[PDB]
Amino acid sequence: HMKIDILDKGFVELVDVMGNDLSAVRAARVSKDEERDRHLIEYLMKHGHETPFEHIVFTFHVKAPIFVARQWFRHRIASYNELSGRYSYEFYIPSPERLEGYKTTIPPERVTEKISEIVDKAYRTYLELIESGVPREVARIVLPLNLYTRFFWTVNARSLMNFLNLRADSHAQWEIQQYALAIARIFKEKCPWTFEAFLKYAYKGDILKEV
Amino acid sequence: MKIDILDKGFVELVDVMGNDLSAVRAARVSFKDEERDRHLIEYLMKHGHETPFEHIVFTFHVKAPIFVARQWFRHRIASYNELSGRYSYEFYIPSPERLEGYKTTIPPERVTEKISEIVDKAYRTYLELIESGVPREVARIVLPLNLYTRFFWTVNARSLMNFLNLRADSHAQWEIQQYALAIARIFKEKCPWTFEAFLKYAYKGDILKEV
Amino acid sequence: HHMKIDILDKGFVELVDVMGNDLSAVRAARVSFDMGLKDEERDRHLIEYLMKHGHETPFEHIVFTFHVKAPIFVARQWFRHRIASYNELSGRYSKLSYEFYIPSPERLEGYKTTIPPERVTEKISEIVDKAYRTYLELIESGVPREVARIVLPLNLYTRFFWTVNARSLMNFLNLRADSHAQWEIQQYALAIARIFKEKCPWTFEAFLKYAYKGDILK
Amino acid sequence: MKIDILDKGFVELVDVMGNDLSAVRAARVSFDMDEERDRHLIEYLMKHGHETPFEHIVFTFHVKAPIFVARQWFRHRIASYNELSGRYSKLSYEFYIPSPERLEGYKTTIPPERVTEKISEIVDKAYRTYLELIESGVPREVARIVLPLNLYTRFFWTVNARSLMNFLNLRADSHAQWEIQQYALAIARIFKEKCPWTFEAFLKYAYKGDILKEVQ
Ligand SMILES: Cc1cc2c(cc1C)N(C[C@H](O)[C@H](O)[C@H](O)COP(=O)(O)OP(=O)(O)OC[C@H]1O[C@@H](n3cnc4c(N)ncnc43)[C@H](O)[C@@H]1O)c1[nH]c(=O)[nH]c(=O)c1N2C=O
Ligand SMILES: Cc1cc2c(cc1C)N(C[C@H](O)[C@H](O)[C@H](O)COP(=O)(O)OP(=O)(O)OC[C@H]1O[C@@H](n3cnc4c(N)ncnc43)[C@H](O)[C@@H]1O)c1[nH]c(=O)[nH]c(=O)c1N2C=O
Ligand SMILES: Cc1cc2c(cc1C)N(C[C@H](O)[C@H](O)[C@H](O)COP(=O)(O)OP(=O)(O)OC[C@H]1O[C@@H](n3cnc4c(N)ncnc43)[C@H](O)[C@@H]1O)c1[nH]c(=O)[nH]c(=O)c1N2
Ligand SMILES: Cc1cc2c(cc1C)N(C[C@H](O)[C@H](O)[C@H](O)COP(=O)(O)OP(=O)(O)OC[C@H]1O[C@@H](n3cnc4c(N)ncnc43)[C@H](O)[C@@H]1O)c1[nH]c(=O)[nH]c(=O)c1N2
């Protein structure tokens, strides 16, 4: 499998894929020739005939902090299956470099330490409550937003391109930009013609034209 | 895998992503044993845990009369790409057996002939208009509802099961029931555990428990 | 809430109901900053800002219900818009009335025909008359409606209720209120745009200026 | 119409389009078409699974809920949401503190009153850390990651009667977490008030949960 590490403990892993660039060509024509088929992909992208790209589907396995997953799960045109907090416990601790370009009254390394401290105290409280007989669904409410979760994400190339427009962009939070770069990399590997046509004609973000 | 329907129709499997284990994987979130896995499929189906079945996706190539495709395209939770009537000619002629169980004042063979006569006259009216310089988008409005169309259908196992509940049923028009039987057969071949578990616990129709 | 626009020879687009207006999108957007409605100038500015920068989810809180009478070839195209709700007349249970879209000779203006446009109109009426007569003969003889209706041409009128939010409605206008779309659906999309303009003037104006991809509405 | 939920939460009806008769109109168009016949049609639609007419009834809710509740709720894709952003808003001291009664029926080695206190303590410590980071110049989007899952959020929810009934089947049920059950009871109450025939028919023929057939 194709697996990209994200943040300190996260990842994006390709689980499955149905189709490639020719799946959109076949769907558009309702039925190869490299030059005519690439020309069609570009024609579809430039004129907004996006429905043929829905016949390309991906399944990802993603490990991400809850604050990142909350943003991600806002994308309704997809399928999700997530780990339940009701039925390990790792946390995203930003490195001092996350604060590069910000003027802080305390050194960036003390911000990292303060974050570790509060997650350690939160986690210890959670374990103490669980050991005391408190149900998991109640005890987990003390856990911070940087707690890592895992989910399977099934999405088609059209909804994936919408996700890249919105998340592979400087206005999106830096943490989800990182995940969106890994999504774009896997997408580019499986659908190079669709990805190149997307960048040239439909892509509304900024970071994929620079990175 | 291709199944012939009606006089000139078909259902053909173009592609598939996943199998029964894709739903097992999604329910667990991980990327066990055959008996435990088959038991989990049944457990998910009996308790209405349907989201894991969304990670199994199919692409079909369907050739169907427009009156059948109009009913089929009412299923919004799926992807379609159809032949265009403006730019992109065979018709569904029911056999006398289609009227078995109905008391008609004219012989069922005369009904078949009357239907052929209409398609012949409308088709020739269409060709006359086209030859006279009338644009295709205008001339085609005279064509009857039994005109065959072709489409690509990308659907997940969850929306496919909803389609079987509604169309592989005696309340659905007989013509779409024929198409739904072919969809059920391809589904059964690719996902035998999901299909078997669906029939036992979730299936609301009647014809799949008889045919 | 009520509006009705006549389309083609026998069709229409009628506004049945509407939930919200421009301020519904303002309220939905402001939750982001823990705020709500402010003043008319600031609120109108926010609508334009949302539209220009692609902040489309607030426009989903504005919903419309339409009652449409359209030929089946138009409705087939329309029903491809999945992010909406539909309830249509059934050819299986209803006895179909003599209503078909007959294009007027003016529909072929700009086209060189070997027969007069008036004869195209007449040829269309003749084939629909024969198809309709065959349909009535079959249902009178005991053929089930669901079988007898298959002989009916694509210009047969249908009726449907359409519940759609302002975001999906704007997608519909981008695709159908455009010169590449068939002239008949363009007519329906103009009526949809006109009702939308009346109920959501700020959203409509911002759509035309920043997001609208078609040509005919400009 | 505003219903208070938990210690600081709520469900408020913002807007509604349609009523029971909206579903009656949508259904009768099939056949090119009084109170007793209309109520009978609603029951017929519900019992035979004719659900699309109920999509023409739409609601807008304004909900204040803890993030762990909002996370489960937002899993309902057939709806529209607009939420408070943790990136642009300065967060207020609004956290869900369960009362000792939340642990009734559970054998704990510490008193339930100590569980409530332990939750408040860690909430107080995490909130103080958040404020210290924010005051130090740490961007909000980074600083808020230390905040616990019981932090309250606010959102607008636009949903039709069909997706709302799916939500009640799954959340107004004893298998759903107690906290979201509370929210689903308030949703059911507002739905019952606006669509009494649809609600009554739903309970009698389509409702798969348990708590709405026991709780008034
Ligand atoms: C930089 C940034 C900041 C913020 C946010 C996002 C970004 C990038 N978002 C999330 C978006 O609103 C949206 O949910 C997401 O981008 C998915 O964005 P989205 O585009 O709505 O994705 P989708 O997958 O749900 O749907 C895919 C497509 O399907 C259509 N669609 C689907 N369901 C529909 C329906 N019901 N009605 C109409 N059309 C519908 C529509 O065309 C849509 O593009 C916020 N949301 C919010 O509530 N408050 C906020 O402050 C913010 N903001 C801070 O986080
Ligand atoms: C025997 C029979 C007779 C008739 C018809 C059908 C049959 C079987 N149908 C079609 C159905 O109404 C429905 O469109 C279709 O079955 C898809 O049926 P459907 O069940 O609506 O399927 P979907 O794929 O569109 O969506 C899949 C699931 O997703 C959810 N969903 C999707 N979009 C939603 C949304 N916007 N709001 C809420 N939930 C929504 C919902 O849970 C749904 O089950 C008719 N429709 C109509 O208008 N008049 C009629 O006389 C008839 N009737 C004559 O043909
Ligand atoms: C120039 C040109 C030419 C053609 C076509 C389009 C254009 C622009 N089409 C496409 C077809 O007309 C399409 O079904 C309608 O435009 C419906 O449009 P949406 O998908 O935009 O609306 P819809 O209402 O279905 O969805 C609205 C929005 O939600 C999103 N969406 C909904 N469902 C989705 C899903 N499953 N996956 C990903 N995203 C989803 C999309 O972002 C979409 O814009 C076509 N069709 C055809 O069959 N044959 C043809 O020959 C042509 N030709
Ligand atoms: C008690 C309990 C326990 C859990 C969960 C729920 C509940 C009630 N869930 C969440 C569950 O998987 C699901 O996300 C929602 O609760 C149910 O949302 P629906 O998909 O039914 O509604 P939603 O509003 O998303 O959709 C409504 C209807 O539309 C259809 N639909 C929508 N989008 C679709 C698509 N892309 N494909 C096919 N059909 C679609 C379906 O018919 C569905 O019923 C969960 N989840 C989890 O990940 N792990 C877990 O451990 C649990 N545990």
Numbering used by the authors:
A (entry chain B): 0 to 30, 36 to 91, 95 to 218
B (entry chain A): 1 to 31, 36 to 92, 96 to 218
C (entry chain D): -1 to 216
D (entry chain C): 1 to 33, 37 to 219
Paper quotes:
ThyX relies on the flavin adenine dinucleotide (FAD) as well as N5,N10-methylenetetrahydrofolate (CH2THF) as methylene donor for activity, while nicotinamide adenine dinucleotide phosphate (NADPH) acts as an electron donor. This enzyme forms a distinct class of thymidylate synthase that differs from the human thymidylate synthase TYMS or prokaryotic ThyA in terms of structure and mechanism.
In addition, we attempted to study the reaction of reduced ThyX with CH2O in crystallo. A clear additional density on FAD was observed in both structures, specifically in three out of four FAD molecules present in apo-ThyX/synthetic flavin carbinolamine and in two FAD molecules in FADH−•CH2O. This density fits with a CH2OH group attached to the N5 atom of the isoalloxazine ring and is thus attributed to the N5-C5a carbinolamine FAD adduct in both structures: in the first case, it is the synthetic compound, while in the second it is the product of the reaction between FADH− and CH2O in crystallo. The carbinolamine adduct adopts a butterfly conformation, significantly bent along its C10a–C4a axis with a dihedral angle ~12° and its N5 is pyramidal, consistent with an sp3 hybridized nitrogen and alkylation of N5. In both structures, the carbinolamine groups adopt a similar axial position lying toward the si-face of FAD and interact with a water molecule. In the case of the FADH−•CH2O structure, an inorganic phosphate occupies the dUMP-binding site and makes an additional interaction with the carbinolamine moiety. Our structures are perfectly superimposable with that of the ThyX/dUMP/folate ternary complex previously reported, with the phosphate ligand placed at a position similar to that of the phosphate group of dUMP.
